[PDB]
Symmetry: D2
Subunit: 322 residues, 4 copies
Amino acid sequence: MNNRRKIVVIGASNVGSAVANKIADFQLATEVVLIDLNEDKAWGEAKDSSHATSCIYSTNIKFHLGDYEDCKDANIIVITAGPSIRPGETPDRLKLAGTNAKIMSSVMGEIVKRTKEAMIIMITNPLDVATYVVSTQFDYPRNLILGTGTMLETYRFRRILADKYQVDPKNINGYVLGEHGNAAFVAWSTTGCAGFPIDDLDEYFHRTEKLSHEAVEQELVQVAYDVINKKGFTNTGIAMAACRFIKSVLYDEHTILPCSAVLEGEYGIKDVALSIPRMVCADGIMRSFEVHLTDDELEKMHKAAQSVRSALDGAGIKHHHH
Amino acid sequence: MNNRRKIVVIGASNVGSAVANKIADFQLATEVVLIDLNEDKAWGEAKDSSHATSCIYSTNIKFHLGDYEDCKDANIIVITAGPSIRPGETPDRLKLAGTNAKIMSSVMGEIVKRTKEAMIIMITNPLDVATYVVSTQFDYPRNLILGTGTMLETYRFRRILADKYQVDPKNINGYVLGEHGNAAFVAWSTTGCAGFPIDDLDEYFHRTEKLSHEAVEQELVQVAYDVINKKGFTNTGIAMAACRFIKSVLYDEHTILPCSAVLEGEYGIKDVALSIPRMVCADGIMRSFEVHLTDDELEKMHKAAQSVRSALDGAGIKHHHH
Amino acid sequence: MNNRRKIVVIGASNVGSAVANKIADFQLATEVVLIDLNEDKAWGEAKDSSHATSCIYSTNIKFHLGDYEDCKDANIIVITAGPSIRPGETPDRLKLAGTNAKIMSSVMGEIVKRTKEAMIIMITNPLDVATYVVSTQFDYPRNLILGTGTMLETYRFRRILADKYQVDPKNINGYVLGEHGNAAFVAWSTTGCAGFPIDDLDEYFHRTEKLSHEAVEQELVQVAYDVINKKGFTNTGIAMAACRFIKSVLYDEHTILPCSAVLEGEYGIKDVALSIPRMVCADGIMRSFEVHLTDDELEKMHKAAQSVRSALDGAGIKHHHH
Amino acid sequence: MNNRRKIVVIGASNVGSAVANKIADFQLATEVVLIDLNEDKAWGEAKDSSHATSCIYSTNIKFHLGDYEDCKDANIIVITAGPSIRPGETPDRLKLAGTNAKIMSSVMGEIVKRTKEAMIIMITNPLDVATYVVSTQFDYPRNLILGTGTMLETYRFRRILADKYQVDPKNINGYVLGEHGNAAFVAWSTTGCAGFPIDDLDEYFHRTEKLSHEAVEQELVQVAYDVINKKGFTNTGIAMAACRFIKSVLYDEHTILPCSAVLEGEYGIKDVALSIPRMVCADGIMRSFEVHLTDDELEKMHKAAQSVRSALDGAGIKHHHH
Ligand SMILES: NC(=O)c1ccc[n+]([C@@H]2O[C@H](COP(=O)([O-])OP(=O)(O)OC[C@H]3O[C@@H](n4cnc5c(N)ncnc54)[C@H](O)[C@@H]3O)[C@@H](O)[C@H]2O)c1
Ligand SMILES: NC(=O)c1ccc[n+]([C@@H]2O[C@H](COP(=O)([O-])OP(=O)(O)OC[C@H]3O[C@@H](n4cnc5c(N)ncnc54)[C@H](O)[C@@H]3O)[C@@H](O)[C@H]2O)c1
Ligand SMILES: NC(=O)c1ccc[n+]([C@@H]2O[C@H](COP(=O)([O-])OP(=O)(O)OC[C@H]3O[C@@H](n4cnc5c(N)ncnc54)[C@H](O)[C@@H]3O)[C@@H](O)[C@H]2O)c1
Ligand SMILES: NC(=O)c1ccc[n+]([C@@H]2O[C@H](COP(=O)([O-])OP(=O)(O)OC[C@H]3O[C@@H](n4cnc5c(N)ncnc54)[C@H](O)[C@@H]3O)[C@@H](O)[C@H]2O)c1
């Protein structure tokens, strides 16, 4: 049998290199391979990482430039290839659908020649679009494809309430669901803080100004664009989300998490990827948990479904069926 | 200023040595000191640990036998001294009140000569009794005393439901509150699984036999006695709980957790220690969160209050007031 | 392919439970199985551990009582079964050869029915004896058997010099080789401190009393017996050594380490297990590095060879050949 | 006393953000503060990090934009401010002396108004130049200033030999000393691999082509420029070195490491910063270890001394004396 764990990261720019380096920090692989059209960048990133993994406190993690033959024995393949939205551009990841759908077809085209067994973690934007393209255009075990999705919005939700009330973000339970994008929404019906309603924190802390649900949901969406405008891009929080899914897979955790995959009738929605609660384990997504949404939350899920499906259509990605 | 973190563990037997070794594994201290009436055991435990901390992947953590002068510059002092209930004995930690109240007075008597600044983590049984004795018989900043309490029952709650439904225990939210003992209870009003009711898991997993709340609450209590009878003692889960509180303190996390401290009027209860939800940070317990208990849960909190207060009375520990 | 890592620990007493808990702390497995003749102890240890792995900072590591069918898909099997030398007894692990050789035959007898692919880490004493028995009495890939050996004496060497000079033990390079026992010796020819001779530390620190090589070598041997006499047993340092080998295997590190295996002509020695420098990787021991010993060091290796071979003979274990 | 650990990172670009994120991954602080002339970047980096530290496996590490008032209670201050050498430019960090000496004076000027107690880790290039400027132009406890120096070249040395022979880089002992720059050299006199000479690896591995010391020393220097040319910059290996020093300080390890500080007569050199072996602990640099260099190694140390002192002179930094 094989004691080694091999992870391939496609795209070795800001996101790929942050995912690769978090993997190295948390010692989640034996071997990390970087693939990029720009092989010089992939080589430089891998070389810089190979020096970090020579530290006395690091395991000897093998970093290198590679190619698609490295997908043959990959446990996990994280896809980060393709451009982002840039500072001052329209704050809408769905504008990337046309270009990035084509990159995802090209990249998944090469992967499936080498493997039908690697767990695929999608990060490339538009996240739900990219997750849809690789899930529907190729024969690949559906369980082995996961988009990070609204895991990152969910971290943002936790931090906003953590910062507002000076509470541990880990105490903030529940999910941001829907699109990794402007149709993300807080499923307030799923939420709590340390075993009590989030709306009760104002009473516990004697706040005169009451929490605005709309303010929290807009902040967690808008902060992604503020970071892109001020830092130039984002990579830290997404690298962390990537590692969280990697751990659910490698520790066969059976964790229920918000992540993106093609819906199969949940909330009356099919043939679109969005984030809904799904169990993640060594064999990838075992199933969804169709939590009971309020009428308003259900409306937001439908709006998200409509917005992603329209972006897929605009990029010339077909409807699919069984 | 001081870059070093010094933790003193009082009692170097099964529990103290497990707490000390978890601290070393998670690298939560610069220096770990063991204190025991049996200095030979404390020395042997510290020597065995000093070899582990010579591993290439360990920080150089200084383990040694020490004495109460090591409390002067201690960040944290974990109290594990005194006997447990033994296999085949009456499954009631409160039987330890008379003997262990006296040990706690002796041990806290020595600590307060050297420091008024160390975070004290109580583990010695009866946990609520021991936490009460050190909180009321000495002038010590009240914020700097925490009993692990029903944090351990809460891990047990998570594992039982994790094992029953094959879900991540981290998805199991809410608390076991009251006594670390036979008057522990599940505050079902505080609970969930991954943003939905625990009672809904039977539907998601199409189980014909429905979850019994009473069965879960009895199992999480009874399993402590089964482990004592079959292993001889417990130490792993409590060492883990100890480390969880240490991290809330050292990372100033502001985590809301079940832990034992003297109640100050919550649920109509005062002048007894029980576990209720409390925020833990660098300065110890900042405050409680008096979550709204059902009438049945409130009755169980009162029963727990009555049982611990009667054990304190039976051990000749006075009522105290402001 | 399989994202999961399964480790079986045979013997769930002081050593097995410490190895299992270090594995859980460092998150080195998906699943940890305990096997013991005393299934009650194995069950209790696994239950106590299952509560620790429900902590928010733990991966969902599955602990359970198991049986030899758990060896079928085991990545690693750590053998800790059988008695130790007890306080006040003759300080000679070789006295265990007769009893523990039989246990090792019984245990390895059951393993080889289920697997020819698990990495076997031997810990049971006499370590070199036990490592020899499982290596020679069964057809098993020789590369997949490693005794922890003088890795633990080497940690002891580092700590003694670390404590003497107030230097990081990680700066102490070189090996204790030979028997895990009274014929352990320091291969001074292999040693250094931070890139200079260990004998130069007295000059750097202006010490009037000069380091005694014999004093260091006797201390690192004698301290094992002092810990057994004062603590009752040892487990922490060996659990750490076990985890160090596990990491060399799971991270395919290619680390050169002192570990026990049957010699194949190194130093003129064959058909006995002792610790010599060996490279450890995902496929276990790839090879030895026959470092050039001084005449005195070579004499000590031969004395160790003679002492272990005589203990094997006394326990009725045959000579073997190719 | 204070349970919290606060680290300030000055410069929030590629290097500062990698140092900050490694600190967060290894949980080396309670609070990480970013300072930059570009406060938008510092804010964006801190916000992206604040989302990562909302993961269930992260401690609640507080990231924020800050200012020099955050230096008042800083345990550690890592200085990364100022430009690097850019792709296609002259491969000579010493060309940065004139500009970056002025930035270091400005930055250290502000720090010393708020603290005389923070451990200062210098990273800004020219590393030895920057380390010299902050050590000599201000009254600051000399023990509290360390440049990462040839720790990073030493990781590079380990990786080159690790990759060449398929051995663990942690087995590669000894140091690259002198300038973090073109006058870096391998102190071969200090080296080994797993307790034997590095030159013996060719024999162990039956290599026909013999190791070239000059080839290894040029590769470990040249690879920094290749990474800058191909990746655009470096940050991963330096972030790792930064964390290694942080751990020697916070775990009071007493580790002997190559790091940059003003020499006080070692090798006949004074009033210049270079990397020589130095012990690092909670109080910073306790002392140097003047290892006995060969005549050729001593010549290289003198060449390094001359090259850095000439760059300091060219940037208008004075000679200093006692
Ligand atoms: N899901 C999330 O939460 C999240 C967060 C951040 C970024 N992202 C997305 O991640 C992607 C990467 O972000 P970035 O900042 O690193 O982008 P970037 O534009 O800086 O880099 C993209 C990289 O992909 C490479 N690439 C392009 N086409 C390729 C192909 N066919 N094969 C291999 N490599 C190819 C490019 O050479 C480049 O190195 C973007 O789509 C971004 O929007 C997602
Ligand atoms: N709170 C929890 O969840 C939890 C869990 C497990 C055990 N415990 C409690 O932890 C305690 C320790 O358990 P154990 O199994 O290690 O017990 P043990 O009886 O094996 O060891 C107790 C140790 O305390 C030492 N000691 C006694 N009086 C002392 C004094 N005055 N000063 C210093 N040392 C002293 C003894 O010498 C002995 O080494 C017990 O009270 C047990 O019930 C609590
Ligand atoms: N190599 C080292 O550095 C090192 C260090 C410490 C201990 N040890 C050795 O480890 C072994 C265990 O030490 P301990 O303190 O845990 O011993 P122990 O006597 O406390 O426990 C041994 C356990 O093995 C079990 N066992 C016995 N025969 C068995 C069988 N056939 N199958 C399964 N389980 C069986 C027993 O029931 C018991 O639980 C001893 O031989 C000891 O000397 C080695
Ligand atoms: N020692 C090493 O091994 C090593 C390795 C890599 C880089 N470096 C050095 O680290 C430095 C940073 O590298 P980089 O790639 O991040 O550079 P960069 O040019 O991308 O960023 C430098 C940052 O410093 C900020 N800055 C400039 N002057 C400042 C001031 N007075 N106060 C506060 N912030 C200020 C800038 O706004 C910018 O954000 C360079 O000098 C580089 O050569 C050292």
